[PDB]
C-alpha cells in the first residue's frame, strides 16, 4: 500500500479509477460541488493500479474516494491523515469536508481524527482548526 503525491501524468490512471466507481461514489467524492451548483492530490496504489485518491484544496476543504473492493482496510483513514499532514505543512488554518449523513464510514473517520461535526438532514460538515 503505497501513498504518493499525484502528478499531471497520473490523470489517465485517476480517470480509470473514476470509471470503475459507482455514481454514488462519484457523487460523494464531489459532494460539495454538486451541492453548490490550487490543490494537492494523493493516490493509494496497489501494484500499479490507483485504488484510492484524495485531494486537498487551498481553502482547507478535502475529499477522497477508495475503490469499493479496497475499503475497510484503513486506506481512507491513511489518506485523510496524509491530507492533514499536507495542510499543516502548507500552513492552512483549518481543514474541512462535506458529505451525506448516511455516509457512516466518512463520519467515523472524521470523528476519530478530531473533526468537529455539524449535522443536518441534507448534509454534514466536519471541521478541524489547525492554527
Calpha distance 67→78 (Å, rounded): 14
Site mask, ligand COA, residues 73-92, x = CB under 6 A? Answer: xxxxx---------------
CA 107 vs CA 11, 15, 80, 131: distances in Å? 28, 26, 12, 22
Q: Does 124 bind ligand COA (CB under 6 A)?
A: no
Contact window for ligand COA (CB under 6 A) among 7-15, 33-41, 71-79, 83-91: 71-79
User: Binding residues for ligand COA, how many (CB under 6 A)?
Assistant: 23
DSSP state of 52: E
Site mask, ligand COA, residues 32-51, x = CB under 6 A? Answer: --------------------
Calpha distance 36→21 (Å, rounded): 22
Among all residues, whose Cβ is closest to ligand COA?
76
Amino acid at each position: 500500500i503505497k501513498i504518493r503525491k499525484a502528478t499531471k501524468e497520473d490523470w489517465e490512471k485517476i480517470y480509470q479509477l473514476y470509471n470503475s466507481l459507482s455514481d454514488e461514489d462519484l457523487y460523494l467524492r464531489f459532494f460539495h460541488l454538486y451541492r453548490i451548483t490550487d490543490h494537492v492530490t494523493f493516490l493509494a496504489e496497489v501494484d500499479g493500479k490507483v485504488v484510492g485518491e484524495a485531494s486537498l484544496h487551498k481553502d482547507g476543504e478535502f475529499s477522497l474516494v477508495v475503490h469499493r473492493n479496497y475499503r475497510t482496510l484503513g486506506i481512507g483513514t491513511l489518506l485523510v491523515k496524509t491530507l492533514i499532514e499536507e495542510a499543516k505543512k502548507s500552513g492552512l488554518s483549518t481543514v474541512k469536508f462535506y458529505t451525506l449523513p448516511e455516509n457512516t464510514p466518512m463520519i467515523k473517520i472524521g470523528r476519530k481524527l478530531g473533526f468537529k461535526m455539524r449535522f443536518y438532514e441534507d448534509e454534514v460538515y466536519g471541521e478541524m482548526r489547525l492554527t
